[PDB]
Ligand binder design. Sequence first.
Ligand SMILES: Nc1ncnc2c1c(/C=C/CCCNC(=O)CCCCCCCCCO)cn2[C@H]1C[C@H](O)[C@@H](COP(=O)(O)OP(=O)(O)OP(=O)(O)O)O1
Ligand SMILES: [Mg+2]
Ligand SMILES: [Mg+2]
Ligand SMILES: [Mg+2]
Length: 540
Amino acid sequence: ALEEAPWPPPEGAFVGFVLSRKEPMWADLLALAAARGGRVHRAPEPYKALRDLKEARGLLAKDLSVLALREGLGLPPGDDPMLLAYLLDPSNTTPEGVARRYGGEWTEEAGERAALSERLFANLWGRLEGEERLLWLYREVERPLSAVLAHMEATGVRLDVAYLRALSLEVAEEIARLEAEVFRLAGHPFNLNSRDQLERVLFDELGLPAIGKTEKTGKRSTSAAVLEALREAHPIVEKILQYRELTKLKSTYIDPLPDLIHPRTGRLHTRFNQTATATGRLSSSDPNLQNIPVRTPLGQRIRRAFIAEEGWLLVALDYSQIELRVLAHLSGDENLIRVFQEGRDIHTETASWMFGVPREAVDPLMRRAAKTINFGVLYGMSAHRLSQELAIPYEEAQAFIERYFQSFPKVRAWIEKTLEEGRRRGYVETLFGRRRYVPDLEARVKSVREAAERMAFNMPVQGTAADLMKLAMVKLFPRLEEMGARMLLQVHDELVLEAPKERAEAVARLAKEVMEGVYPLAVPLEVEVGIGEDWLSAKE
DNA sequence: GACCACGGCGCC
DNA sequence: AAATGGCGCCGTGGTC
Ligand SMILES: Nc1ncnc2c1c(/C=C/CCCNC(=O)CCCCCCCCCO)cn2[C@H]1C[C@H](O)[C@@H](COP(=O)(O)OP(=O)(O)OP(=O)(O)O)O1
Ligand SMILES: [Mg+2]
Ligand SMILES: [Mg+2]
Ligand SMILES: [Mg+2]
C-alpha cells in the first residue's frame, strides 16, 4: 500500500503505463504512473505527464520511450526488469510470466504496474548480483541497446505505397489465372486456400500418392516439400506451387504493408522485440520486417518498395558467413580458421559442388541453396533428408556430411563438450555468457533428447552471432547520430541504415569497420556493404 | 468482434 | 515428410 503521492515523481522512479494497444507507435497512452520510496504517483493527464520524466525506467521501458519519441519527447529507456529476467533465463519473455515468477501480478493499471516494476527490479537485480557476465551483458548490451531499438522503431522506413498498390492489381490477375487452371484440372472449384480441401483433391479425387503426414493431426501434408516431390505426377501441382507463392506474398506483404503507413511520419514502423527468443536474437513484429521477401522475382519486386527518403540513400550491411566464423572461434578448429584467414567462401564452394558449376557462375539463388545445406548439415540434418534435399542417393549425401565434418574435427569435439556441459549445469551459453536452459538433454525419449541437443549446441553459435550484432549496434548508433544518419532495421546479421546522399559513402565505410571490429575473434569478421535507393539495390 | 490450433511459409 | 536451429504472419476451421 504505497502512499498516494502527487505528480511529478522524484528522479529515478519506476514508471507504469497502459496502452490502448500493444504497438507503441499506434497506441493511445491511457494512463501513466510512477513509484519510488514507498509512494505511487499517478499522472492526472498521461501525455502532459510524459514531459516530467527524464528516463523510462520499468517494465517495457522501450515501448514507452518509442511513444515519447513519437510525441517529439526525447525520453530514453533505462532499467527494465524484463531485460534482467531475460538474461537470467530467456524463457522469461512476457511481463505476465516475469511478474508471477519474481513477485507480483501484471495487471491493467499504471499504478500497480509502476509498483510492480519497482518490486521486480529489486528482486531481479538481487538475483543478478554475482552473475558478472550477465551483469556485463545488461549494462553493456541490452540496456543501451533498448535505447537504440527505441530510436529505430520511432524512425520507421519509407515505403513506395503506390508501387505496391499497382503490384497488387497485377498479382490479383495472375492469381486468378492460376486458380482457374487449378479448378479446371481438379474438375470443379474449391477453396484453394484450404489445405484440407486441397488434400482431398490431390490424394482422394486425384490419385496422387501421399508423401508425409502433418505433425499434430496426422493429415496428409500438402506442403511445398510434398508438392515438389509431385511436380511431375500431375500438371496441377506446378500451378498450386505458383498459386501458393503469389497468394503468400500478396496476403502477407503487398496488401497489408501499404495500410500500415503512419499518418504523422508517412513511414512504416516495426517493433524490435528484445526478450522474445531463446538464443538472444531479436525478433520483429507488427509488422515483421525481418522476413521481407527476397528469394523469388516477385519477392524482389516487393523488396524494391523499401526505399530511402528523398535526398538519402539506404546502406545495407550483412556479416559474411557469420555463424561459420563464430563456429571457428568457439570450437577453435584450426582447419576452419584457415578457411577464413584465406578468404574462402564455404557457401560458394558448396554451391559450386551442389550444382556442378565453377564458383564464377554461382548465382545468388545457388548460394542461398548452399546456405540451407551448409547450416542444415551443421546443426544436425539427417543423411536421409539431405539425400532427398540434393536429389541425390543416400550414399553420397551420407558422405557429404562426413567430408564436411571431417575437415573440421574440433567442431564435433566442441559439440560434445557443449552438450556435456549443458547436461551438467542445465544450460548452454554464448561467448559472452548469455545462457539458455535446456533440461531435456537428459530426456529418456531419444527423439525428445536429440531435439534438445540440436537446440542446445545451436544456441552458443546463433546466440554469439546475436551478441556480436547487438554490441555492434550499440557501438554504431552514436557514430551515426554524429553523421546525421539513421539506423532503420536489423535482420539478425544485417543492418539497414539511411544516410544523407552526400555522407552515404562515409557512413558505409564507418559502419562496415565498426561491425567488423565489434569484438575481434580468432578469425576476421567481413561485412558486405551496399548502397542504393531501395533495399534490394543496396545489397548488390 | 476476439480467441485459438494448425498447417504452411516468408526471412535469418 | 524428415535428426538442422531461430523467428512471426497468413487463412482455414472452429470456438466463444
Ligand atoms: N537454414 C538455416 N538454418 C540455420 N541457420 C541459418 C539458416 C540460414 C539460411 C539463410 C538463407 C536461406 C536461403 N534459402 C533459399 O532461398 C532457398 C533454399 C532451398 C534451395 C533449393 C534448391 C534446389 C531445389 C530442388 O533441387 C541462415 N542461418 C543463420 C546462419 C547465418 O550465419 C546467419 C545469418 O544469415 P545469412 O546472412 O543469410 O548467412 P551468412 O551470414 O552465413 O551468409 P552470407 O551473409 O551470405 O555471407 O543465419
Ligand atoms: Mg550474413
Ligand atoms: Mg543476412
Ligand atoms: Mg506454429
